Design a protein around this ligand. Sequence first.
Ligand SMILES: [Au+]
Ligand SMILES: [Au+]
Ligand code: NA
Length: 129
Amino acid sequence: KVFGRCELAAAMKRHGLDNYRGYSLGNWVCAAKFESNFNTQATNRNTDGSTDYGILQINSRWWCNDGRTPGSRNLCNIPCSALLSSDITASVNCAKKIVSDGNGMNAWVAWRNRCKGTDVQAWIRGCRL
Ligand SMILES: [Au+]
Ligand SMILES: [Au+]
Ligand code: NA
């Protein structure tokens, strides 16, 4: 599923991310844009051999199992394919565990480099929230 901006904002808000560990909804939307372009099916291999899955590009090095990331963890206790569903629940509930890790949203390289410090509220402009 390829989400619309406001559509994604609203799903994210429903699922409890607006100001989750203090990150305004717009931070989550901006991250999602730059990680996946709002596409639940996005997959990208990392150089270390893990892969990033889904709307928030959650990595098989620590968070999910994809059956080919040797010597890695599965801290959200899911198959990585669950992160690719049209329903973002698993992605969201796993993002919550990630962003609580102590490094906050810096876990998302694209957030840090492209969202952080920016006018992230722009990402929810015009949405009926
Ligand atoms: Au959720
Ligand atoms: Au959802
Ligand atoms: Na893993």
